[PDB]
Write a protein that binds this ligand. Sequence first.
Ligand SMILES: *[C@H](O)[C@H](C[C@@H]1CCNC1=O)NC(=O)[C@H](CC(C)C)NC(=O)OCc1ccccc1
Ligand SMILES: *[C@H](O)[C@H](C[C@@H]1CCNC1=O)NC(=O)[C@H](CC(C)C)NC(=O)OCc1ccccc1
Lengths: 298, 298
Amino acid sequence: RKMAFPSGKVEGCMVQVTCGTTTLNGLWLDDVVYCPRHVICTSEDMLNPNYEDLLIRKSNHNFLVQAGNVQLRVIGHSMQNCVLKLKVDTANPKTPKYKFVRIQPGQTFSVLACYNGSPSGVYQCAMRPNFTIKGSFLNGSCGSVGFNIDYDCVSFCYMHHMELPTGVHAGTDLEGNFYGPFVDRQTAQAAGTDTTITVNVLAWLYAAVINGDRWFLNRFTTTLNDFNLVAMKYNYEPLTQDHVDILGPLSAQTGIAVLDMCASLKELLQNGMNGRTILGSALLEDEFTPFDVVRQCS
Amino acid sequence: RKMAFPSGKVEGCMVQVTCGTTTLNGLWLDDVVYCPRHVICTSEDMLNPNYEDLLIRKSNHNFLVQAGNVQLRVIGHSMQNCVLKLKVDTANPKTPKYKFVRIQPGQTFSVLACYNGSPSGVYQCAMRPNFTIKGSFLNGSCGSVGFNIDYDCVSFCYMHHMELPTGVHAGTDLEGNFYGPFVDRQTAQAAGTDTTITVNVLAWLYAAVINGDRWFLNRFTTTLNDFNLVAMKYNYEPLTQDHVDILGPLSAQTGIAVLDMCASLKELLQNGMNGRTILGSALLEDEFTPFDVVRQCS
Ligand SMILES: *[C@H](O)[C@H](C[C@@H]1CCNC1=O)NC(=O)[C@H](CC(C)C)NC(=O)OCc1ccccc1
Ligand SMILES: *[C@H](O)[C@H](C[C@@H]1CCNC1=O)NC(=O)[C@H](CC(C)C)NC(=O)OCc1ccccc1
């Protein structure tokens, strides 16, 4: 099963930010509210916004932050890359222990989709090699965050800004820097040709070996270099050698060093599953980290 | 995408319940903790328990409940079918507006998987027509619950007790009545042959149209009864008029009559998918309801 982190600690940080006509969501940690900076744009400064001068003309009194129907007072505003920061006069007493990280393509996280500051639902998604995510997001959803958890700490890794022509989504880390070559302005922009997350496909074959039925399992072996070619053709990312021993635990538990493994991914890009399905998916699955496999078998 | 309801309201009601060697999760609402009654069994008892034998042989102090760090004093106990009800001297201040509901086959709910009283993950499930669910659950997971939300109100519908031999799962409503012909005994049980949830498959074909994927549309048309005849043969639940009604929503926003979308699915069942995906998959997905489709497309 694809599984999301429990969302309570992030729900307790979600607020509604309105500036003029635009409402979106804010992230309220301590006495600071983070939200996408295009909240300060009207329907039409959005096509080529000069954010610096948009923001000049805004003052604290132009921002309506609400936790429920309770207004939080804005007492300062600043722009950091593509996110806005609003100092409010109340520290969120729900503030989890947390930090801001910038994730890598292939890494997974959980999205807490919200609308008008109220959580709608939660889902697990991955950062594609072309820096999009395959999410469900509608209008008013910008400012929603992705996150991971480690014990008590919430690691905020994504904030939402944009849908792309092809239906996928684009956003920034919590310091406002976009993932990939995207800009927060309403223009057609390059999706970018995507690839399969090789390390996660191997994580998930391992899960097959663990949780039982390894029918895919075949009796042939390879090394690193040829492995790249015929699948690089079905468009698979370079497995390095340091994806390698994040796959170390799963190799040690199954007994299988990385490459009998490769050579059965061969045959699944060499003559399909033969109509068969591994663990619940009639296709190869590439949105499970090795850590995702260990967590869930753990 | 499969989207679970946000989980914070349930997370604040989850506690650990211990009785001797046996530990699992409980649901802490007002001044009552509910958990699976096989918490009272030893490894050996669970072979063939007479739960009323076992329960008359215990007093309050044999139950240890913990809410994070803090122990809750059990001051009463009580059994309602397959769930135990433990009264405690404190009311859970995080108790939401809630309800207890028994759901029908085909309905969905989100599951908050917990271990030792602590949330670990959240995902969606359907009640199969055979009254099992295709979960992800290990030892210590019992007591985790399934629920839906409805504005402010968490309606609990599932409590977890068991993995059948085939890897699927079985449990009770929160009054403790099993979904299906199972019992809280550790003895091998079979679930009975599953069917496919038809009304949901149509809801996912509609979902697919909305998201640009329309190769499967035909322009044949069919009777409700003609459709159920063919469907039957492929082990699809009857499609009721109610189900037709329920689909009406999605039938407006796409301009496809239910019955014509039946015609297309009927062609899908007589001829297979010949190598094509719908919404990415080589199988027809039946674990989205109408309501889960609207919710995530409005
Ligand atoms: C912010 O709430 C919103 C999120 C979008 C809207 C629907 N689904 C989403 O992901 N962002 C915008 O509406 C964005 C504002 C600009 C200042 C970046 N405009 C936008 O998303 O245009 C790109 C697009 C291309 C194709 C379809 C839909 C949107
Ligand atoms: C409750 O904590 C536990 C959850 C099972 C354990 C593995 N995955 C689950 O969902 N329930 C039981 O152990 C249950 C006990 C009642 C029948 C008294 N028996 C059961 O689920 O099947 C036994 C089993 C044990 C270990 C692995 C797989 C199945």
